[PDB]
Paper text:
Next, our crystal structure of the Importin-α and GM130-NLS complex reveals a non-conventional binding mode that accounts for a higher affinity for full-length Importin-α compared to the IBB domain. Next, we sought to determine the crystal structure of the GM130 N-terminal region plus Importin–α(ΔIBB) complex to understand their binding mode. Our crystal structure of the Importin-α•GM130-NLS complex showed that three regions of the GM130-NLS are involved in binding Importin-α. Residues Tyr-20, Gln-22, and Asn-24 within this α-helix are evolutionarily conserved from Xenopus to human and provide salt bridges and hydrogen bonds that interact with residues Glu-354, Glu-396, and Lys-353 on Importin-α. Notably, the crystal structure of the native GM130-NLS•Importin-α complex reveals that Ser-25 is located at the bottom of the GM130 α-helix, and is not part of the GM130–Importin-α interaction network.
GM130, a non-nuclear Golgi peripheral membrane protein, has been shown to bear an NLS-like sequence, allowing it to interact with Importin-α13. Since both Importin-α and p115 bind to the GM130 N-terminus and Importin-α pulldown by GM130 is enriched during mitosis, we hypothesize that binding of Importin-α to GM130 during mitosis may suppress the p115 and GM130 interaction, contributing to Golgi disassembly. Our data describe a molecular mechanism whereby Importin-α modulates mitotic Golgi morphology via a Ran pathway-independent interaction with GM130.
Residue numbers in the entry:
A (entry chain A): 13 to 40
B (entry chain C): 76 to 88, 90 to 239, 241 to 479, 481 to 497
Write the structure that this text describes.
């Protein structure tokens, strides 16, 4: 059977990579 | 400055206000614990939200937009404070500014708000955010727009694709065509967040996986799968990995696009997270049809999985065991005994010293179905001796007195093949 990402992330988290959620502006 | 001096100036009230709000922005950009909570407690957010509206005074717009962007980068409650002050429609209005740096700041802030979670994401969508954001990208040449500007729009777009419940189908359908274009633009950071957006959309029911795959993106996804920039490979492999959890026809599109030729580098990639997710995706390809298993065989990937099973961090060894049990459950007799010629037996037998009840059973299922293939060819006696000589029989012998379900599975191998 195929196993979807939730089961993989549930097996392996914390630490599974993801994109940035929030960014603080220090620049400009 | 102190917060108190800022309050005298915001409430002095126009030339004085900009310096104090400007002073607030500098304070909120400070490295260590900008004092977000006190600015909210002082009641300054309603003025900042008020500040987004001085179409006359662009300077107070930009500063308040910056200060608010940086309040919304904090906790969910701090983000809540910004929304509760009315910032969403004010920011949406600001996307149309003739000043590019102000339009971007509204884009950035909206990205922070949507990134907090599914409720704020859908509320931002309900306010009509998608159309003016996409309207900004409706240029013949995406290289026309400033590079830093484009990066935020892509990032902001990706947070709108993210996260129980999923985004409304209409929003994903409406944003997606601009997403495919961005997936081909030549900037490394834009590509990464394009893959991220695509990676989000492919995690779910097969109807969502199906949707991205129609747009012809899988050949390009396999291309980024082979990029040298780790920030690109990471989301590309996640997106490909999700697609191969689907049905047999979607899985055929990834193989046919050439994805498997990249996996020799990926399954030896020194970046821990890359090697494990490549092993997991292999576990879902080896859960497929027999003609797809022989194609892993044809691409030479069995030696690479024996290698990961032999030596890798422990979590991947468990991922490879699933790839192997899946292979032995669906493969032809010849493909499974080919595993034996490639050296599958020793790293499997070595891994059975582990005490986790769960993986012991995964390994034992692979061994029994493999013996049954040996039964059909008449080679069981060669294999029984092979398992014994690398120390596997002692371990198997020892699992009868070690979860009881593991123990009864181990005895069965003993009664049938080692008596």
């Amino acid at each position: 059977a195929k196993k979807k990402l939730r089961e993989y992330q549930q097996r392996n988290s914390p630490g599974v990579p993801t994109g940035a959620k929030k960014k603080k502006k220090i620049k400009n | 400055w102190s917060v108190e001096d800022i309050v005298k100036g915001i409430n002095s009230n126009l030339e004085s206000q900009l310096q104090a709000t400007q002073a607030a922005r500098k304070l909120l950009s400070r490295e260590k614990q900008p004092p977000i909570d006190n600015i909210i407690r002082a009641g300054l957010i309603p003025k900042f939200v008020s500040f987004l509206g001085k179409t006359d005074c662009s300077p107070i717009q930009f500063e308040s937009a910056w200060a608010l962007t940086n309040i919304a980068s904090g906790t969910s409650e701090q983000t809540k404070a910004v929304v509760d002050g009315g910032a969403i429609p004010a920011f949406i209005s600001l996307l149309a500014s003739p000043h590019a740096h102000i339009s971007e700041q509204a884009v950035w802030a909206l990205g922070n708000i949507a990134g907090d979670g599914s409720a704020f994401r859908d509320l931002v969508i309900k306010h009509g955010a998608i159309d003016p954001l996409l309207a900004l990208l409706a240029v013949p040449d995406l290289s026309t727009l400033a590079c830093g500007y484009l990066r935020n729009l892509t990032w902001t777009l990706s947070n709108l694709c993210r996260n129980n419940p999923a985004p409304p189908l209409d929003a994903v359908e409406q944003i997606l065509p601009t997403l495919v274009r961005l997936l081909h633009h030549n900037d490394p950071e834009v590509l990464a967040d394009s893959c991220w957006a695509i990676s989000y959309l492919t995690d779910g029911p097969n109807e969502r996986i199906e949707m991205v795959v129609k747009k012809g993106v899988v050949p390009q996804l396999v291309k980024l799968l082979g990029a040298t920039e780790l920030p690109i490979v990471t989301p590309a492999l996640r997106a490909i990995g999700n697609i191969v959890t689907g049905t047999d026809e979607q899985t055929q599109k990834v193989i046919d696009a050439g994805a498997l030729a990249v996996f020799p580098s990926l399954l030896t990639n020194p970046k821990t997270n890359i090697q494990k997710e490549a092993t997991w995706t292999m576990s879902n390809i080896t859960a497929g049809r027999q003609d797809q298993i022989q194609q892993v065989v044809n691409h030479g990937l069995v030696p690479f999985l024996v290698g990961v099973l032999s030596k890798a961090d422990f979590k991947t060894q468990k991922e490879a065991a699933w790839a192997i049990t899946n292979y032995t459950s669906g493969g032809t007799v010849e493909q499974i005994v080919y595993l034996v010629h490639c050296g599958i037996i020793e790293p499997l037998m070595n891994l059975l010293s582990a005490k986790d009840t769960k993986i012991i059973q995964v390994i034992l299922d692979a061994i029994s179905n493999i013996f049954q293939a040996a039964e059909k060819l008449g080679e069981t006696e060669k294999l029984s001796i092979m398992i014994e000589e690398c120390g596997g029989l002692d371990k198997i012998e020892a699992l009868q007195r070690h979860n009881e379900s593991v123990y009864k599975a181990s005895l069965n191998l003993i009664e049938k093949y080692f008596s």
